[PDB]
C-alpha cells in the first residue's frame, strides 16, 4: 500500500568557481545555473523505527 519512494534521483551540478554571471539582454528563454542546492528529507512515515543516538 501507499506511495512508492520518489527520491530526486540525480541533480544537475553546482556552477564551479570562476564561471562569470551571465547577462541576459531582452526576452530569450534560459536554462538553470545552480548556486545553492540542498535536499532536506523529512519523515512522512509513522512511529520510531529511525532512532538516532548522540
Amino acid at each position: 500500500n501507499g506511495k512508492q519512494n520518489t527520491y530526486f534521483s540525480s541533480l544537475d551540478n553546482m556552477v564551479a568557481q570562476g564561471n562569470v554571471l551571465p547577462v541576459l539582454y531582452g526576452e530569450m528563454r534560459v536554462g538553470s545555473r545552480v548556486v545553492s542546492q540542498e535536499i532536506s528529507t523529512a519523515d512522512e512515515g509513522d512511529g520510531g523505527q529511525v532512532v538516532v543516538i548522540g
Binding site: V15, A16, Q17, G18, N19, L21
Partner: protein, 232 residues
C-alpha cells in the same frame, strides 16, 4: 574625422608647418603613484615646455607604433623612457604598481603653444588646438640602467577588459570594501588576516566569508558560498 579644430586642419594641410610637439602625462593616481608631466624637448629659452599654462619637464621619452584600427590594434604601441638617474627604478621597483596607470599623449603644432615658450611671444597662442590619445600601461617589457620600455593598450582593449564582467566565486567577495554593493559604513573592525583591530587606517576586508562576518555584512557578501571550489 578626428575632433580637431579648423586651425589644426589648416596647419595640417599647410605647405610649411611649425614642428609638431608630443606632450606625455604618465598618471598613476589609480595605482598608488602620482601624475608626472614629460616632453622630449625644451623651448628656445632652454626651459620646460608650458602648454595650457602647465609645465612638461624635459625628459628623454619616445612612443612608437601608435595606430587607429577598425579591427583591433594587433601592434600594442611601446613607450620607452630614460632610466638614467634611476627615475624609473625608484618609480615602482616592482613594475606591478606601474601596470594599469594611464598615459595621455597630446599632439599640438608649435604655432599654438603659449607666448611664455617663445622670446618674442606668440599672436597665434591657443590652449584649445590638440589631438589627445589615452593608453593604459599594461606590462613593463624591460628595464635597464639606460631606459625602461612599457607596453600600452587602448582603455577598452586590455587583458582585464572582458565582458560579462563579474566572475562567480565561492568564498571570495568581489565588491570593493565600503564601496556601494558592500554598503558597510560602520566603525573600523579588522585587518585582512582577520585580526580584530579598532583602527580606521589598519582595517581592510579579507573578502573571505569570515572577513565579511567581522562587519556582520554577510547580507551582501558578493560571493556565492557553496558553488563548486574546483574550476573544471
Amino acid at each position: 574625422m578626428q575632433d580637431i579644430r579648423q586651425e589644426t586642419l589648416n596647419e595640417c594641410t599647410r605647405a610649411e608647418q611649425s614642428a609638431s610637439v608630443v606632450l606625455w602625462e604618465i598618471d598613476l593616481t589609480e595605482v598608488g603613484g602620482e601624475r608626472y608631466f614629460f616632453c622630449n624637448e625644451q623651448n628656445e629659452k632652454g626651459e620646460p615646455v608650458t602648454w595650457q599654462g602647465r609645465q612638461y619637464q624635459p625628459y628623454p621619452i619616445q612612443g612608437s607604433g601608435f595606430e587607429l584600427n577598425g579591427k583591433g590594434t594587433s601592434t600594442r604601441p611601446t613607450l620607452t623612457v630614460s632610466n638614467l638617474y634611476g627615475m624609473v627604478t625608484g618609480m615602482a621597483e616592482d613594475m606591478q604598481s606601474l601596470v594599469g596607470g594611464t598615459v595621455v599623449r597630446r599632439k599640438v603644432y608649435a604655432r599654438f603653444l603659449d607666448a611664455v615658450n617663445f622670446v618674442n611671444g606668440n599672436s597665434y597662442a591657443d590652449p584649445e588646438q590638440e589631438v589627445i590619445s589615452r593608453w593604459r600601461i599594461e606590462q613593463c617589457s624591460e628595464l635597464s640602467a639606460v631606459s625602461a620600455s612599457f607596453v600600452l593598450s587602448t582603455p577598452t582593449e586590455t587583458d582585464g577588459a572582458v565582458f560579462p564582467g563579474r566572475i562567480m566565486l565561492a568564498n571570495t567577495c568581489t565588491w570593493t570594501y565600503r564601496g556601494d554593493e558592500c554598503g558597510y559604513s560602520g566603525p573600523a573592525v579588522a585587518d585582512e588576516y582577520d585580526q580584530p583591530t579598532s583602527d580606521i587606517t589598519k582595517d581592510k576586508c579579507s573578502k573571505c566569508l569570515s572577513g565579511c562576518k567581522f562587519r556582520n555584512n554577510v547580507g551582501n557578501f558578493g560571493g556565492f558560498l557553496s558553488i563548486n571550489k574546483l574550476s573544471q
